[PDB]
Structure formats: C-alpha cells, structure tokens
Amino acid sequence: KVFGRCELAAAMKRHGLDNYRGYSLGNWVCAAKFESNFNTQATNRNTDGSTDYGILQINSRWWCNDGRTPGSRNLCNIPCSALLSSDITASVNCAKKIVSDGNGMNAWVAWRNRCKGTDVQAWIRGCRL
C-alpha cells in the first residue's frame, strides 16, 4: 500500500509514535517519505548483501529475517516480509526498538541527511491529528 501523507501521519500517531523517544510525529512521516515514498512494499538491496524493508526500510542484517542475510541477528523477531504488509504495526513496533537502542533516528541515513534539522512539522500540516 502507498499511504497518503496525512493518512500515515494519522496511523503512526494512533500507534503511539508521536514523540516516542522525543521525535515529533513529523520526524517520522519525513523519514518515511524519503525512505520509501510512503510505499510499504518497498525493498532495496545493499552491497553487504542485506536488504531494507517496508515504509521505514528496516534492515535484515539486524532487525528481521528474510533468510538470505547471514550475519543476521533478528532482534525484531519478525520475518522481513511482515514489514511489508499494509498494516504498519510490525514496522512501528520494530522501529521503536531501533530508535530506543542508541543512535536515535540517526539509524536512518535518510532521516539524518534530509530530515534532521529542517522544520519537520511541515509534513503534518493539513492533518486532522
């Protein structure tokens, strides 16, 4: 599914992500836009042979099993495929872990380089939140 800017904002909120660990809702919609273009079916292979999965592009080297990344710790205890379904529940749940765990949202190269320090509130303008 390809979420609407506002529709996703709404959903991430409902899922308790607004201010989770101190990141405004906007920080999340932003990361997701540039990470996956609000498309949950998105995947991308990295050089190291891991693959990125979902709306938030969670990695298989650490967070989830897709059964063809070897070093693989599956800290999320989810098969990667799960992260691609139209309910974002599993992705949030896992994204929460990723972000708690030390580097905050820096863990998302995209967020860091294109989101960090821009007025991210602009992503949730218009929204009935």
mmCIF file of N, CA and C in Angstrom:
data_model
loop_
_atom_site.group_PDB
_atom_site.id
_atom_site.type_symbol
_atom_site.label_atom_id
_atom_site.label_comp_id
_atom_site.label_asym_id
_atom_site.label_seq_id
_atom_site.Cartn_x
_atom_site.Cartn_y
_atom_site.Cartn_z
ATOM 1 N N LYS A 1 0.869 -1.184 0.000
ATOM 2 C CA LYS A 1 0.000 0.000 0.000
ATOM 3 C C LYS A 1 0.904 1.233 0.000
ATOM 4 N N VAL A 2 0.418 2.259 -0.675
ATOM 5 C CA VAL A 2 1.081 3.567 -0.738
ATOM 6 C C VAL A 2 0.182 4.535 0.032
ATOM 7 N N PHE A 3 0.617 4.825 1.247
ATOM 8 C CA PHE A 3 -0.064 5.773 2.138
ATOM 9 C C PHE A 3 -0.036 7.233 1.692
ATOM 10 N N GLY A 4 -1.053 7.953 2.136
ATOM 11 C CA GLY A 4 -1.173 9.399 1.907
ATOM 12 C C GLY A 4 -0.386 10.015 3.066
ATOM 13 N N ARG A 5 0.174 11.179 2.778
ATOM 14 C CA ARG A 5 0.985 11.939 3.740
ATOM 15 C C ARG A 5 0.238 11.974 5.073
ATOM 16 N N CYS A 6 -0.941 12.572 5.016
ATOM 17 C CA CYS A 6 -1.864 12.640 6.156
ATOM 18 C C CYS A 6 -2.429 11.381 6.814
ATOM 19 N N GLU A 7 -2.731 10.415 5.961
ATOM 20 C CA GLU A 7 -3.243 9.106 6.380
ATOM 21 C C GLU A 7 -2.264 8.318 7.252
ATOM 22 N N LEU A 8 -1.006 8.378 6.840
ATOM 23 C CA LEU A 8 0.107 7.762 7.569
ATOM 24 C C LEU A 8 0.442 8.464 8.886
ATOM 25 N N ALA A 9 0.353 9.784 8.834
ATOM 26 C CA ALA A 9 0.609 10.653 9.990
ATOM 27 C C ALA A 9 -0.376 10.117 11.024
ATOM 28 N N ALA A 10 -1.640 10.143 10.630
ATOM 29 C CA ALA A 10 -2.747 9.640 11.453
ATOM 30 C C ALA A 10 -2.507 8.284 12.116
ATOM 31 N N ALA A 11 -2.045 7.356 11.295
ATOM 32 C CA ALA A 11 -1.763 5.978 11.718
ATOM 33 C C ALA A 11 -0.599 5.730 12.677
ATOM 34 N N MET A 12 0.453 6.499 12.461
ATOM 35 C CA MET A 12 1.679 6.430 13.267
ATOM 36 C C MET A 12 1.356 6.976 14.655
ATOM 37 N N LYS A 13 0.497 7.983 14.653
ATOM 38 C CA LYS A 13 0.004 8.622 15.879
ATOM 39 C C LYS A 13 -0.766 7.592 16.707
ATOM 40 N N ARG A 14 -1.732 6.979 16.041
ATOM 41 C CA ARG A 14 -2.635 6.002 16.658
ATOM 42 C C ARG A 14 -1.755 4.912 17.272
ATOM 43 N N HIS A 15 -0.687 4.608 16.551
ATOM 44 C CA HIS A 15 0.345 3.664 17.001
ATOM 45 C C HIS A 15 1.393 4.107 18.020
ATOM 46 N N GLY A 16 1.116 5.256 18.615
ATOM 47 C CA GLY A 16 1.965 5.846 19.658
ATOM 48 C C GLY A 16 3.366 6.395 19.385
ATOM 49 N N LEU A 17 3.600 6.670 18.111
ATOM 50 C CA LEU A 17 4.856 7.265 17.635
ATOM 51 C C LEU A 17 5.161 8.761 17.714
ATOM 52 N N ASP A 18 4.096 9.521 17.916
ATOM 53 C CA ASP A 18 4.171 10.975 18.106
ATOM 54 C C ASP A 18 4.967 11.051 19.410
ATOM 55 N N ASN A 19 6.085 11.755 19.321
ATOM 56 C CA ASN A 19 7.006 11.946 20.450
ATOM 57 C C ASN A 19 7.695 10.786 21.169
ATOM 58 N N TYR A 20 7.645 9.637 20.513
ATOM 59 C CA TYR A 20 8.227 8.391 21.028
ATOM 60 C C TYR A 20 9.689 8.839 21.072
ATOM 61 N N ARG A 21 10.295 8.597 22.225
ATOM 62 C CA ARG A 21 11.701 8.932 22.479
ATOM 63 C C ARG A 21 12.119 10.369 22.165
ATOM 64 N N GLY A 22 11.106 11.208 22.022
ATOM 65 C CA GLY A 22 11.282 12.641 21.754
ATOM 66 C C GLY A 22 11.313 13.189 20.327
ATOM 67 N N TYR A 23 10.896 12.329 19.410
ATOM 68 C CA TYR A 23 10.774 12.669 17.986
ATOM 69 C C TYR A 23 9.298 12.963 17.717
ATOM 70 N N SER A 24 9.053 14.216 17.364
ATOM 71 C CA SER A 24 7.746 14.670 16.870
ATOM 72 C C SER A 24 7.259 13.765 15.738
ATOM 73 N N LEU A 25 5.942 13.694 15.633
ATOM 74 C CA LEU A 25 5.261 12.918 14.589
ATOM 75 C C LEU A 25 5.854 13.173 13.206
ATOM 76 N N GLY A 26 6.137 14.445 12.961
ATOM 77 C CA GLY A 26 6.685 14.916 11.685
ATOM 78 C C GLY A 26 8.021 14.279 11.300
ATOM 79 N N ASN A 27 8.809 14.017 12.330
ATOM 80 C CA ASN A 27 10.151 13.440 12.185
ATOM 81 C C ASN A 27 9.991 12.070 11.528
ATOM 82 N N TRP A 28 8.908 11.413 11.909
ATOM 83 C CA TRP A 28 8.536 10.100 11.369
ATOM 84 C C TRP A 28 7.928 9.942 9.976
ATOM 85 N N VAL A 29 7.090 10.908 9.641
ATOM 86 C CA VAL A 29 6.417 10.970 8.339
ATOM 87 C C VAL A 29 7.509 11.330 7.330
ATOM 88 N N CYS A 30 8.392 12.206 7.780
ATOM 89 C CA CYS A 30 9.502 12.717 6.967
ATOM 90 C C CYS A 30 10.444 11.582 6.563
ATOM 91 N N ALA A 31 10.859 10.840 7.577
ATOM 92 C CA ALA A 31 11.836 9.754 7.429
ATOM 93 C C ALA A 31 11.255 8.764 6.420
ATOM 94 N N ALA A 32 9.977 8.486 6.613
ATOM 95 C CA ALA A 32 9.230 7.534 5.783
ATOM 96 C C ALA A 32 9.026 7.904 4.314
ATOM 97 N N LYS A 33 8.883 9.200 4.099
ATOM 98 C CA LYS A 33 8.682 9.774 2.764
ATOM 99 C C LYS A 33 9.926 9.498 1.917
ATOM 100 N N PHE A 34 11.042 10.004 2.418
ATOM 101 C CA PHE A 34 12.355 9.825 1.790
ATOM 102 C C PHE A 34 13.055 8.468 1.876
ATOM 103 N N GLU A 35 12.424 7.585 2.634
ATOM 104 C CA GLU A 35 12.975 6.262 2.949
ATOM 105 C C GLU A 35 12.312 5.360 1.907
ATOM 106 N N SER A 36 10.994 5.462 1.868
ATOM 107 C CA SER A 36 10.154 4.647 0.983
ATOM 108 C C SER A 36 9.016 5.184 0.116
ATOM 109 N N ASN A 37 8.888 6.500 0.148
ATOM 110 C CA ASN A 37 7.843 7.222 -0.586
ATOM 111 C C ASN A 37 6.454 6.724 -0.186
ATOM 112 N N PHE A 38 6.325 6.467 1.106
ATOM 113 C CA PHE A 38 5.068 6.013 1.711
ATOM 114 C C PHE A 38 4.521 4.707 1.135
ATOM 115 N N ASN A 39 5.423 3.984 0.490
ATOM 116 C CA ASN A 39 5.127 2.676 -0.102
ATOM 117 C C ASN A 39 5.721 1.579 0.783
ATOM 118 N N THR A 40 4.817 0.852 1.422
ATOM 119 C CA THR A 40 5.166 -0.274 2.296
ATOM 120 C C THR A 40 5.736 -1.556 1.685
ATOM 121 N N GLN A 41 5.537 -1.669 0.382
ATOM 122 C CA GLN A 41 6.065 -2.780 -0.418
ATOM 123 C C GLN A 41 7.509 -2.637 -0.900
ATOM 124 N N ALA A 42 8.074 -1.484 -0.577
ATOM 125 C CA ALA A 42 9.458 -1.144 -0.925
ATOM 126 C C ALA A 42 10.551 -2.027 -0.321
ATOM 127 N N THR A 43 11.536 -2.318 -1.157
ATOM 128 C CA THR A 43 12.734 -3.067 -0.758
ATOM 129 C C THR A 43 13.914 -2.471 -1.525
ATOM 130 N N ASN A 44 15.085 -2.639 -0.931
ATOM 131 C CA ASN A 44 16.357 -2.212 -1.526
ATOM 132 C C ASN A 44 17.530 -3.007 -0.950
ATOM 133 N N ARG A 45 18.285 -3.596 -1.864
ATOM 134 C CA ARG A 45 19.492 -4.365 -1.534
ATOM 135 C C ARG A 45 20.716 -3.461 -1.384
ATOM 136 N N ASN A 46 21.499 -3.776 -0.363
ATOM 137 C CA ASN A 46 22.702 -3.011 -0.002
ATOM 138 C C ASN A 46 23.805 -3.924 -0.542
ATOM 139 N N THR A 47 24.979 -3.329 -0.683
ATOM 140 C CA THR A 47 26.213 -4.056 -1.007
ATOM 141 C C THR A 47 26.620 -5.263 -0.162
ATOM 142 N N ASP A 48 26.348 -5.136 1.127
ATOM 143 C CA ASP A 48 26.823 -6.082 2.144
ATOM 144 C C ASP A 48 25.888 -7.290 2.124
ATOM 145 N N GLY A 49 24.875 -7.173 1.280
ATOM 146 C CA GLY A 49 24.009 -8.298 0.907
ATOM 147 C C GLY A 49 22.698 -8.349 1.692
ATOM 148 N N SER A 50 22.638 -7.489 2.697
ATOM 149 C CA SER A 50 21.411 -7.234 3.462
ATOM 150 C C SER A 50 20.449 -6.511 2.519
ATOM 151 N N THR A 51 19.205 -6.445 2.964
ATOM 152 C CA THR A 51 18.112 -5.827 2.204
ATOM 153 C C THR A 51 17.325 -4.997 3.219
ATOM 154 N N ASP A 52 16.734 -3.932 2.702
ATOM 155 C CA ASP A 52 15.947 -2.985 3.501
ATOM 156 C C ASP A 52 14.479 -3.260 3.173
ATOM 157 N N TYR A 53 13.672 -3.194 4.220
ATOM 158 C CA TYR A 53 12.240 -3.495 4.147
ATOM 159 C C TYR A 53 11.144 -2.683 4.839
ATOM 160 N N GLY A 54 10.115 -2.392 4.060
ATOM 161 C CA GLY A 54 9.000 -1.539 4.489
ATOM 162 C C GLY A 54 8.945 -0.030 4.256
ATOM 163 N N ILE A 55 7.945 0.576 4.875
ATOM 164 C CA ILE A 55 7.772 2.034 4.885
ATOM 165 C C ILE A 55 8.922 2.787 5.556
ATOM 166 N N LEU A 56 9.514 2.115 6.530
ATOM 167 C CA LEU A 56 10.649 2.644 7.297
ATOM 168 C C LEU A 56 12.003 2.000 6.994
ATOM 169 N N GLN A 57 11.983 1.154 5.975
ATOM 170 C CA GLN A 57 13.178 0.450 5.493
ATOM 171 C C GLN A 57 14.128 -0.164 6.523
ATOM 172 N N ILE A 58 13.562 -1.065 7.309
ATOM 173 C CA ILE A 58 14.295 -1.793 8.353
ATOM 174 C C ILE A 58 15.192 -2.854 7.716
ATOM 175 N N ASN A 59 16.416 -2.904 8.223
ATOM 176 C CA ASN A 59 17.453 -3.821 7.731
ATOM 177 C C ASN A 59 17.418 -5.262 8.241
ATOM 178 N N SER A 60 17.755 -6.165 7.333
ATOM 179 C CA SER A 60 17.812 -7.605 7.615
ATOM 180 C C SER A 60 19.039 -8.238 8.272
ATOM 181 N N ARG A 61 20.063 -7.410 8.416
ATOM 182 C CA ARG A 61 21.349 -7.816 8.997
ATOM 183 C C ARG A 61 21.199 -7.856 10.519
ATOM 184 N N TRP A 62 20.284 -7.026 10.993
ATOM 185 C CA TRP A 62 19.934 -6.945 12.417
ATOM 186 C C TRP A 62 18.545 -7.060 13.046
ATOM 187 N N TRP A 63 17.600 -6.409 12.387
ATOM 188 C CA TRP A 63 16.189 -6.414 12.795
ATOM 189 C C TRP A 63 15.145 -7.473 12.452
ATOM 190 N N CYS A 64 15.345 -8.073 11.289
ATOM 191 C CA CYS A 64 14.425 -9.072 10.732
ATOM 192 C C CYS A 64 15.081 -10.104 9.811
ATOM 193 N N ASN A 65 14.517 -11.301 9.852
ATOM 194 C CA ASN A 65 14.921 -12.410 8.978
ATOM 195 C C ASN A 65 14.174 -12.472 7.643
ATOM 196 N N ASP A 66 14.965 -12.476 6.581
ATOM 197 C CA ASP A 66 14.479 -12.736 5.220
ATOM 198 C C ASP A 66 15.174 -13.978 4.659
ATOM 199 N N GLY A 67 15.887 -14.647 5.552
ATOM 200 C CA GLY A 67 16.552 -15.923 5.256
ATOM 201 C C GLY A 67 17.633 -16.071 4.183
ATOM 202 N N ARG A 68 18.157 -14.923 3.782
ATOM 203 C CA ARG A 68 19.328 -14.838 2.900
ATOM 204 C C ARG A 68 20.357 -13.755 3.227
ATOM 205 N N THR A 69 20.282 -13.296 4.468
ATOM 206 C CA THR A 69 21.329 -12.471 5.082
ATOM 207 C C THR A 69 21.952 -13.180 6.284
ATOM 208 N N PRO A 70 23.123 -13.743 6.032
ATOM 209 C CA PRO A 70 23.911 -14.445 7.051
ATOM 210 C C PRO A 70 24.456 -14.143 8.447
ATOM 211 N N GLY A 71 24.924 -12.917 8.586
ATOM 212 C CA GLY A 71 25.441 -12.397 9.857
ATOM 213 C C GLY A 71 24.186 -12.378 10.729
ATOM 214 N N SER A 72 23.065 -12.194 10.053
ATOM 215 C CA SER A 72 21.765 -11.993 10.701
ATOM 216 C C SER A 72 21.289 -12.262 12.128
ATOM 217 N N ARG A 73 21.058 -11.170 12.835
ATOM 218 C CA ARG A 73 20.544 -11.195 14.209
ATOM 219 C C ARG A 73 19.169 -10.769 13.699
ATOM 220 N N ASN A 74 18.161 -11.251 14.407
ATOM 221 C CA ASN A 74 16.755 -10.969 14.093
ATOM 222 C C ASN A 74 16.187 -10.413 15.398
ATOM 223 N N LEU A 75 16.691 -9.242 15.749
ATOM 224 C CA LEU A 75 16.349 -8.566 17.006
ATOM 225 C C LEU A 75 14.881 -8.181 17.186
ATOM 226 N N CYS A 76 14.211 -8.061 16.052
ATOM 227 C CA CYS A 76 12.787 -7.713 15.995
ATOM 228 C C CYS A 76 11.909 -8.956 16.127
ATOM 229 N N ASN A 77 12.558 -10.096 15.945
ATOM 230 C CA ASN A 77 11.879 -11.388 15.791
ATOM 231 C C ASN A 77 10.672 -11.328 14.853
ATOM 232 N N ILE A 78 10.959 -10.906 13.633
ATOM 233 C CA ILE A 78 9.960 -10.811 12.562
ATOM 234 C C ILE A 78 10.702 -11.271 11.306
ATOM 235 N N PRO A 79 9.935 -11.887 10.423
ATOM 236 C CA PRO A 79 10.406 -12.288 9.095
ATOM 237 C C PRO A 79 10.221 -10.900 8.482
ATOM 238 N N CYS A 80 11.209 -10.529 7.683
ATOM 239 C CA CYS A 80 11.216 -9.253 6.956
ATOM 240 C C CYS A 80 9.958 -8.930 6.151
ATOM 241 N N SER A 81 9.427 -9.976 5.538
ATOM 242 C CA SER A 81 8.224 -9.889 4.701
ATOM 243 C C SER A 81 7.054 -9.229 5.430
ATOM 244 N N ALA A 82 6.986 -9.522 6.718
ATOM 245 C CA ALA A 82 5.970 -8.961 7.616
ATOM 246 C C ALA A 82 5.933 -7.434 7.622
ATOM 247 N N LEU A 83 7.081 -6.865 7.289
ATOM 248 C CA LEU A 83 7.350 -5.434 7.472
ATOM 249 C C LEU A 83 6.782 -4.720 6.245
ATOM 250 N N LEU A 84 6.414 -5.535 5.269
ATOM 251 C CA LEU A 84 5.842 -5.062 4.002
ATOM 252 C C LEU A 84 4.334 -5.007 3.756
ATOM 253 N N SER A 85 3.607 -5.479 4.755
ATOM 254 C CA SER A 85 2.152 -5.653 4.676
ATOM 255 C C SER A 85 1.614 -4.241 4.910
ATOM 256 N N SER A 86 0.344 -4.086 4.575
ATOM 257 C CA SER A 86 -0.358 -2.800 4.667
ATOM 258 C C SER A 86 -0.748 -2.243 6.036
ATOM 259 N N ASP A 87 -0.644 -3.117 7.025
ATOM 260 C CA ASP A 87 -0.771 -2.746 8.439
ATOM 261 C C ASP A 87 0.706 -2.528 8.772
ATOM 262 N N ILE A 88 0.968 -1.352 9.320
ATOM 263 C CA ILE A 88 2.327 -0.905 9.648
ATOM 264 C C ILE A 88 2.752 -1.239 11.079
ATOM 265 N N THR A 89 1.900 -2.019 11.726
ATOM 266 C CA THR A 89 2.017 -2.320 13.158
ATOM 267 C C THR A 89 3.384 -2.906 13.513
ATOM 268 N N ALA A 90 3.758 -3.911 12.738
ATOM 269 C CA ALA A 90 5.038 -4.613 12.895
ATOM 270 C C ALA A 90 6.270 -3.736 12.674
ATOM 271 N N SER A 91 6.128 -2.839 11.711
ATOM 272 C CA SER A 91 7.146 -1.827 11.400
ATOM 273 C C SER A 91 7.398 -0.754 12.459
ATOM 274 N N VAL A 92 6.297 -0.273 13.011
ATOM 275 C CA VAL A 92 6.308 0.668 14.137
ATOM 276 C C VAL A 92 7.006 -0.062 15.285
ATOM 277 N N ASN A 93 6.429 -1.200 15.631
ATOM 278 C CA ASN A 93 6.835 -1.982 16.805
ATOM 279 C C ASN A 93 8.355 -2.149 16.789
ATOM 280 N N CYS A 94 8.858 -2.409 15.592
ATOM 281 C CA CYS A 94 10.266 -2.755 15.370
ATOM 282 C C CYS A 94 11.088 -1.467 15.323
ATOM 283 N N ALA A 95 10.487 -0.467 14.697
ATOM 284 C CA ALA A 95 11.081 0.870 14.563
ATOM 285 C C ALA A 95 11.330 1.518 15.925
ATOM 286 N N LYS A 96 10.482 1.135 16.868
ATOM 287 C CA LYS A 96 10.553 1.614 18.254
ATOM 288 C C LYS A 96 11.835 1.122 18.930
ATOM 289 N N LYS A 97 12.103 -0.156 18.715
ATOM 290 C CA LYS A 97 13.337 -0.807 19.174
ATOM 291 C C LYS A 97 14.626 -0.211 18.606
ATOM 292 N N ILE A 98 14.535 0.165 17.340
ATOM 293 C CA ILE A 98 15.701 0.523 16.522
ATOM 294 C C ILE A 98 16.106 1.846 17.175
ATOM 295 N N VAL A 99 15.136 2.745 17.220
ATOM 296 C CA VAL A 99 15.294 4.067 17.840
ATOM 297 C C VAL A 99 15.597 4.315 19.318
ATOM 298 N N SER A 100 15.222 3.331 20.120
ATOM 299 C CA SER A 100 15.448 3.347 21.571
ATOM 300 C C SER A 100 16.911 3.031 21.890
ATOM 301 N N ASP A 101 17.543 2.366 20.934
ATOM 302 C CA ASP A 101 18.561 1.344 21.205
ATOM 303 C C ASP A 101 19.938 2.008 21.181
ATOM 304 N N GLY A 102 19.920 3.278 20.809
ATOM 305 C CA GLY A 102 21.098 4.152 20.876
ATOM 306 C C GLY A 102 21.451 5.420 20.096
ATOM 307 N N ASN A 103 21.299 5.306 18.786
ATOM 308 C CA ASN A 103 21.601 6.394 17.846
ATOM 309 C C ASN A 103 20.394 7.237 17.433
ATOM 310 N N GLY A 104 19.286 6.954 18.097
ATOM 311 C CA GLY A 104 18.009 7.640 17.858
ATOM 312 C C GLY A 104 17.794 7.389 16.365
ATOM 313 N N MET A 105 17.150 8.362 15.741
ATOM 314 C CA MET A 105 16.772 8.294 14.324
ATOM 315 C C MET A 105 17.891 8.466 13.294
ATOM 316 N N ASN A 106 19.106 8.520 13.819
ATOM 317 C CA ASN A 106 20.325 8.660 13.011
ATOM 318 C C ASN A 106 20.496 7.308 12.318
ATOM 319 N N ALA A 107 19.782 6.332 12.855
ATOM 320 C CA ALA A 107 19.859 4.937 12.401
ATOM 321 C C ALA A 107 19.318 4.887 10.972
ATOM 322 N N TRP A 108 18.629 5.960 10.618
ATOM 323 C CA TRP A 108 18.040 6.133 9.283
ATOM 324 C C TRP A 108 18.765 7.207 8.471
ATOM 325 N N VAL A 109 19.688 6.733 7.648
ATOM 326 C CA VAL A 109 20.581 7.594 6.859
ATOM 327 C C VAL A 109 19.794 8.734 6.213
ATOM 328 N N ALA A 110 18.678 8.349 5.617
ATOM 329 C CA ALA A 110 17.704 9.292 5.053
ATOM 330 C C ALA A 110 17.143 10.409 5.934
ATOM 331 N N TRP A 111 16.839 10.025 7.164
ATOM 332 C CA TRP A 111 16.294 10.936 8.178
ATOM 333 C C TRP A 111 17.397 11.949 8.488
ATOM 334 N N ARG A 112 18.548 11.402 8.851
ATOM 335 C CA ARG A 112 19.751 12.189 9.157
ATOM 336 C C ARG A 112 20.173 13.246 8.136
ATOM 337 N N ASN A 113 20.225 12.803 6.889
ATOM 338 C CA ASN A 113 20.625 13.644 5.754
ATOM 339 C C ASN A 113 19.644 14.591 5.061
ATOM 340 N N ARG A 114 18.377 14.224 5.163
ATOM 341 C CA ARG A 114 17.268 15.003 4.597
ATOM 342 C C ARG A 114 16.085 15.475 5.443
ATOM 343 N N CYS A 115 16.147 15.106 6.713
ATOM 344 C CA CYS A 115 15.069 15.361 7.677
ATOM 345 C C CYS A 115 15.563 16.173 8.874
ATOM 346 N N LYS A 116 16.560 15.606 9.539
ATOM 347 C CA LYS A 116 17.271 16.269 10.640
ATOM 348 C C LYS A 116 17.495 17.764 10.404
ATOM 349 N N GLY A 117 16.882 18.546 11.280
ATOM 350 C CA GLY A 117 17.090 19.997 11.344
ATOM 351 C C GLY A 117 16.437 20.884 10.284
ATOM 352 N N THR A 118 15.252 20.455 9.877
ATOM 353 C CA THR A 118 14.515 21.068 8.765
ATOM 354 C C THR A 118 13.400 21.113 9.810
ATOM 355 N N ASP A 119 12.326 21.784 9.423
ATOM 356 C CA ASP A 119 11.198 22.076 10.317
ATOM 357 C C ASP A 119 10.323 20.970 9.727
ATOM 358 N N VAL A 120 10.286 19.864 10.454
ATOM 359 C CA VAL A 120 9.606 18.638 10.017
ATOM 360 C C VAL A 120 8.092 18.623 10.217
ATOM 361 N N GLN A 121 7.651 19.530 11.075
ATOM 362 C CA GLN A 121 6.233 19.877 11.214
ATOM 363 C C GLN A 121 5.413 20.113 9.951
ATOM 364 N N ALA A 122 6.130 20.511 8.910
ATOM 365 C CA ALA A 122 5.543 20.798 7.595
ATOM 366 C C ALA A 122 4.937 19.559 6.935
ATOM 367 N N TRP A 123 5.326 18.415 7.474
ATOM 368 C CA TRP A 123 4.873 17.105 6.993
ATOM 369 C C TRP A 123 3.490 16.683 7.490
ATOM 370 N N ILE A 124 3.147 17.220 8.650
ATOM 371 C CA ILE A 124 1.810 17.077 9.236
ATOM 372 C C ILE A 124 0.843 18.261 9.294
ATOM 373 N N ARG A 125 1.183 19.277 8.515
ATOM 374 C CA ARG A 125 0.274 20.384 8.197
ATOM 375 C C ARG A 125 -0.862 19.829 7.337
ATOM 376 N N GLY A 126 -2.053 20.331 7.625
ATOM 377 C CA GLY A 126 -3.280 19.940 6.921
ATOM 378 C C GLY A 126 -4.066 18.856 7.660
ATOM 379 N N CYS A 127 -3.318 18.061 8.410
ATOM 380 C CA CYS A 127 -3.841 16.868 9.085
ATOM 381 C C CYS A 127 -4.754 17.018 10.302
ATOM 382 N N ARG A 128 -5.832 16.250 10.266
ATOM 383 C CA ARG A 128 -6.760 16.116 11.397
ATOM 384 C C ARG A 128 -5.910 15.096 12.155
ATOM 385 N N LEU A 129 -5.299 15.587 13.222
ATOM 386 C CA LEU A 129 -4.470 14.772 14.119
ATOM 387 C C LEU A 129 -5.036 15.237 15.462
#
